[PDB]
Design an enzyme around this catalytic site. Structure first.
Site, PDB file in Angstrom:
ATOM      1  N   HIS A  75     -19.206  17.622  -4.948  1.00  0.00           N
ATOM      2  CA  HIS A  75     -18.621  17.435  -3.627  1.00  0.00           C
ATOM      3  C   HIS A  75     -18.447  15.963  -3.281  1.00  0.00           C
ATOM      4  CE1 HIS A  75     -22.877  17.101  -2.075  1.00  0.00           C
ATOM      5  NE2 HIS A  75     -22.298  16.323  -1.178  1.00  0.00           N
ATOM      6  N   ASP A  99     -22.401  22.422  -8.145  1.00  0.00           N
ATOM      7  CA  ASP A  99     -22.097  21.187  -7.425  1.00  0.00           C
ATOM      8  C   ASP A  99     -22.484  19.969  -8.257  1.00  0.00           C
ATOM      9  OD1 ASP A  99     -21.048  19.669  -5.412  1.00  0.00           O
ATOM     10  OD2 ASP A  99     -22.828  19.772  -4.112  1.00  0.00           O
ATOM     11  N   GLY A 155     -25.224  10.706   2.549  1.00  0.00           N
ATOM     12  CA  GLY A 155     -24.906   9.708   1.556  1.00  0.00           C
ATOM     13  C   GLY A 155     -25.904   9.587   0.419  1.00  0.00           C
ATOM     14  N   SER A 157     -26.838  12.446  -1.544  1.00  0.00           N
ATOM     15  CA  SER A 157     -26.590  13.421  -2.597  1.00  0.00           C
ATOM     16  C   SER A 157     -26.358  12.688  -3.916  1.00  0.00           C
ATOM     17  CB  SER A 157     -25.393  14.316  -2.256  1.00  0.00           C
ATOM     18  OG  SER A 157     -24.161  13.615  -2.322  1.00  0.00           O
TER      19      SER A 157
HETATM   20  C1  LIG Z   1     -15.987  20.879  -3.186  1.00  0.00           C
HETATM   21  O1  LIG Z   1     -16.625  21.612  -4.209  1.00  0.00           O
HETATM   22  C2  LIG Z   1     -17.958  21.960  -3.942  1.00  0.00           C
HETATM   23  C3  LIG Z   1     -18.763  22.761  -4.975  1.00  0.00           C
HETATM   24  C4  LIG Z   1     -20.221  23.130  -4.687  1.00  0.00           C
HETATM   25  C5  LIG Z   1     -20.872  22.691  -3.341  1.00  0.00           C
HETATM   26  N1  LIG Z   1     -22.278  23.051  -3.047  1.00  0.00           N
HETATM   27  C6  LIG Z   1     -22.876  22.624  -1.795  1.00  0.00           C
HETATM   28  C7  LIG Z   1     -24.338  22.987  -1.487  1.00  0.00           C
HETATM   29  C8  LIG Z   1     -22.031  21.817  -0.798  1.00  0.00           C
HETATM   30  O2  LIG Z   1     -22.602  21.386   0.419  1.00  0.00           O
HETATM   31  C9  LIG Z   1     -21.773  20.427   1.129  1.00  0.00           C
HETATM   32  C10 LIG Z   1     -21.852  19.147   0.796  1.00  0.00           C
HETATM   33  C11 LIG Z   1     -23.409  18.888   1.091  1.00  0.00           C
HETATM   34  C12 LIG Z   1     -23.871  17.643   1.590  1.00  0.00           C
HETATM   35  O3  LIG Z   1     -23.591  17.180   2.646  1.00  0.00           O
HETATM   36  N2  LIG Z   1     -24.897  17.028   0.737  1.00  0.00           N
HETATM   37  C13 LIG Z   1     -25.698  15.826   1.039  1.00  0.00           C
HETATM   38  C14 LIG Z   1     -24.959  14.480   1.134  1.00  0.00           C
HETATM   39  O4  LIG Z   1     -25.507  13.470   1.389  1.00  0.00           O
HETATM   40  N3  LIG Z   1     -23.543  14.471   0.872  1.00  0.00           N
HETATM   41  S1  LIG Z   1     -22.816  12.931   0.958  1.00  0.00           S
HETATM   42  O5  LIG Z   1     -23.428  11.972   0.041  1.00  0.00           O
HETATM   43  O6  LIG Z   1     -22.939  12.357   2.303  1.00  0.00           O
HETATM   44  C15 LIG Z   1     -21.070  13.225   0.592  1.00  0.00           C
HETATM   45  C16 LIG Z   1     -20.301  14.275   1.421  1.00  0.00           C
HETATM   46  C17 LIG Z   1     -20.714  13.117  -0.893  1.00  0.00           C
HETATM   47  C18 LIG Z   1     -20.284  12.016   0.083  1.00  0.00           C
HETATM   48  C19 LIG Z   1     -27.199  15.624   1.004  1.00  0.00           C
HETATM   49  C20 LIG Z   1     -26.513  15.961   2.337  1.00  0.00           C
HETATM   50  C21 LIG Z   1     -26.914  15.050   3.535  1.00  0.00           C
HETATM   51  C22 LIG Z   1     -26.817  15.436   4.817  1.00  0.00           C
HETATM   52  C23 LIG Z   1     -26.294  16.826   5.237  1.00  0.00           C
HETATM   53  C24 LIG Z   1     -25.161  16.590   6.256  1.00  0.00           C
HETATM   54  C25 LIG Z   1     -24.697  17.934   6.879  1.00  0.00           C
HETATM   55  C26 LIG Z   1     -24.217  18.892   5.751  1.00  0.00           C
HETATM   56  C27 LIG Z   1     -25.319  19.973   5.535  1.00  0.00           C
HETATM   57  C28 LIG Z   1     -25.011  20.847   4.308  1.00  0.00           C
HETATM   58  N4  LIG Z   1     -26.085  21.783   4.201  1.00  0.00           N
HETATM   59  C29 LIG Z   1     -25.971  22.935   3.312  1.00  0.00           C
HETATM   60  O7  LIG Z   1     -24.930  23.269   2.860  1.00  0.00           O
HETATM   61  O8  LIG Z   1     -27.190  23.616   3.050  1.00  0.00           O
HETATM   62  C30 LIG Z   1     -27.092  24.846   2.331  1.00  0.00           C
HETATM   63  C31 LIG Z   1     -26.512  25.937   3.125  1.00  0.00           C
HETATM   64  C32 LIG Z   1     -26.503  24.702   0.945  1.00  0.00           C
HETATM   65  C33 LIG Z   1     -27.738  25.352   0.359  1.00  0.00           C
HETATM   66  C34 LIG Z   1     -28.416  25.222   1.706  1.00  0.00           C
HETATM   67  C35 LIG Z   1     -24.932  19.940   3.075  1.00  0.00           C
HETATM   68  O9  LIG Z   1     -25.880  19.296   2.736  1.00  0.00           O
HETATM   69  N5  LIG Z   1     -23.641  19.840   2.321  1.00  0.00           N
HETATM   70  C36 LIG Z   1     -22.483  20.475   2.596  1.00  0.00           C
HETATM   71  N6  LIG Z   1     -20.668  21.463  -1.080  1.00  0.00           N
HETATM   72  C37 LIG Z   1     -20.067  21.898  -2.351  1.00  0.00           C
HETATM   73  C38 LIG Z   1     -18.599  21.519  -2.628  1.00  0.00           C
END
Ligand SMILES: COc1ccc2nc(C)c(O[C@@H]3C[C@H]4C(=O)N[C@]5(C(=O)NS(=O)(=O)C6(C)CC6)C[C@H]5/C=C\CCCCC[C@H](NC(=O)OC5(C)CCC5)C(=O)N4C3)nc2c1
Ligand SMILES: [Zn+2]
Length: 197
Positions: A75, A99, A155, A157
């Site tokens: 993602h 993911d 940010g 992940s």
């Molecule tokens: C497109 O193809 C695909 C394939 C498989 C995918 N599989 C997943 C699980 C997924 O989830 C998305 C992205 C992830 C995220 O946001 N990840 C962190 C992050 O930091 N990203 S990031 O760096 O800012 C960024 C966006 C890269 C630049 C750590 C998160 C930090 C804060 C959460 C903010 C609110 C969001 C809360 C949410 N919660 C949640 O979904 O919890 C559950 C229901 C899932 C199991 C439990 C959450 O975390 N996400 C939502 N997208 C996928 C997409």
């Protein structure tokens, strides 16, 4: 067809230093150089360490080297190449169902060792070099010992969950929140990486 653009490469813009007494973020490339490196895919900066801060044109997140593979989240990276000294490098692993994506670990990086300790006392490393204690609660879940707003995890992940010995236990994937407070995390277990390889 002639006017169709190509998405840029993921670019390493910094790292989380875990070398010594204190964890701290280091930036190695500013936004202008990042945007240019994303378009050319040519990054000649030296890479060091285990946890890289990476960026696209539109997103920033983390990537972690385990067993000679730089791992991050689909993602964040999508199917993108990563910039390297010789040009864009194609993904070696892509699994949207997990993911998960990965490239060969860059020359100069250090790889974390996959954990075989079976410990449930974990530590999540964020992009701000916070080392957050996490109690493992399942194959892909752990609870924060000290909950905090999800803003602090955004940010991060692609960052690692580590065991007490500093082995890699998993890759941070998602945050579980109630009223904006992160109570738990969802992560890709290292065994799922080891199976992917
Ligand atoms: C497109 O193809 C695909 C394939 C498989 C995918 N599989 C997943 C699980 C997924 O989830 C998305 C992205 C992830 C995220 O946001 N990840 C962190 C992050 O930091 N990203 S990031 O760096 O800012 C960024 C966006 C890269 C630049 C750590 C998160 C930090 C804060 C959460 C903010 C609110 C969001 C809360 C949410 N919660 C949640 O979904 O919890 C559950 C229901 C899932 C199991 C439990 C959450 O975390 N996400 C939502 N997208 C996928 C997409
Ligand atoms: Zn271990």
């Amino acid at each position: 067809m002639a006017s169709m653009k190509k998405k840029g490469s993921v670019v390493i813009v910094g790292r989380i230093n875990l070398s010594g007494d204190t964890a701290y973020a280091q930036q190695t490339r500013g936004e202008e150089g990042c945007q240019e490196t994303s378009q050319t895919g040519r990054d000649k900066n030296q890479v060091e360490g285990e946890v890289q801060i990476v960026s696209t044109a539109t997103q920033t997140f983390l990537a972690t080297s385990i067993n000679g593979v730089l791992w991050t989240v689909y993602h964040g990276a999508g199917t993108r190449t990563i910039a390297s000294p010789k040009g864009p490098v194609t993904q070696m692993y892509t699994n949207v169902d997990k993911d998960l994506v990965g490239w060969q670990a860059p020359q100069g990086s250090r790889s974390l060792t996959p954990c075989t300790c079976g410990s449930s006392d974990l530590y999540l490393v964020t992009r701000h070099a916070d080392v957050i204690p996490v109690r493992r609660r399942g194959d892909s879940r752990g609870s924060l010992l000290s909950p905090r707003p999800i803003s602090y995890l955004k940010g991060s992940s692609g960052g690692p969950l580590l065991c007490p010995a500093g082995h890699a236990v998993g890759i941070f994937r998602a945050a579980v929140s109630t009223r904006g407070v992160a109570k738990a995390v969802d992560f890709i277990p290292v065994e799922s990486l080891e199976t992917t390889m």
